[PDB]
């Protein structure tokens, strides 16, 4: 070997930065953040931050290169590219004044699915029961929320349906163990398959939406959590012999519209 170079291997090959990862994936920053949210990828902290960055003390974010190598092969990135192409073609269709072809294009489209991502994040049902805490927190926040320009009515309706189904199952199986009424909301702790699951439900009062927050991130988080609950609720209902999805009583829904 001749002499080898410095800052090329060791603590610097297994830690790549945000700009390097984004340019390696050849994808935008927003889609990189969406992929990290879906796959559960998080930044790291190397023991020698002056070596992971090549001799520089400038601040930066490290990402465990093997995680990006795994992210390279994700089938959701191809679906993102396909959606970009679809959006371009739909824009061309409307811009030409031809609306029938635009409707035809929107009929012939398929979105991505997060089934395999949820399977690899949680190889077993107990892991899903472990993350169901924060999943339920986010869903119960979105359930009590007015529809606006960014978050639509259908999103909130789906979140409310999931929350009602979860509450109905927990009430049917009588799994509530602890309750705590606080100034923020109500904390419920239940016993799901030998795990303690604690979630916060806000009070049913009008909300004041701050313009500071970015719902662009919360929508992706909700999109992941909704699918996680769909699978977890199916599993829980079918293990107990119940029929899933539960039938909605339209007569009793018009008076109170809750778990009952």
């Amino acid at each position: 070997m001749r002499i080898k170079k410095k800052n090329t291997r060791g603590n610097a090959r297994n830690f790549i930065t945000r700009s390097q990862a984004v340019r390696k994936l050849q994808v935008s920053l927003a889609d990189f953040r969406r992929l990290c949210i879906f796959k559960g990828i998080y930044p790291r902290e190397p023991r020698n931050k002056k070596k992971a960055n090549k001799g520089s003390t400038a601040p930066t974010t490290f990402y465990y290169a093997k995680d990006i190598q795994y992210l390279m092969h994700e089938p959701v990135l191809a679906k993102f590219r396909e959606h970009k192409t679809f959006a371009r073609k739909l824009t061309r269709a409307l811009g030409r004044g031809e609306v029938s072809s635009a409707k035809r294009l929107e009929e012939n489209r398929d979105s991505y699915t997060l089934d395999h991502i949820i399977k690899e994040r949680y190889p077993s049902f107990p892991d899903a029961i472990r993350d169901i805490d924060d999943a339920l927190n986010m869903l119960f926040l979105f359930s009590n929320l007015p529809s606006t320009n960014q978050v639509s009515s259908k999103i909130i309706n789906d979140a409310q349906k999931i929350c009602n189904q979860w509450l109905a199952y927990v009430a049917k199986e009588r799994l509530v163990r602890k309750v705590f009424v606080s100034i923020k909301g109500v904390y419920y702790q239940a016993n799901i398959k030998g795990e303690e699951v604690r979630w916060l439900v806000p009070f049913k009062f009008p909300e004041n939406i701050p313009s500071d927050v970015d719902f662009r991130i919360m929508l992706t988080f909700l999109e992941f959590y909704s699918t996680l609950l769909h699978f977890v609720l199916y599993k829980l209902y079918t293990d107990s012999g119940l029929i899933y999805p539960p039938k909605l009583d339209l007569k009793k829904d018009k008076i109170i519209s809750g778990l009952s």
Binding site: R33, C36, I37, I41, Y42, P43, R44, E45, T61, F62, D134, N137, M138, L141, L145, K184, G185, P202, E207, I209, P210, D212, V213, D214, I217, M218, F221
Partner: peptide, 16 residues
């Protein structure tokens, strides 16, 4: 209430 959830979700993928 929204801000707390937003901060938690921001920490879930931006906090080392």
């Amino acid at each position: 209430s929204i801000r707390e959830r937003f901060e938690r979700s921001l920490d879930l993928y931006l906090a080392p």
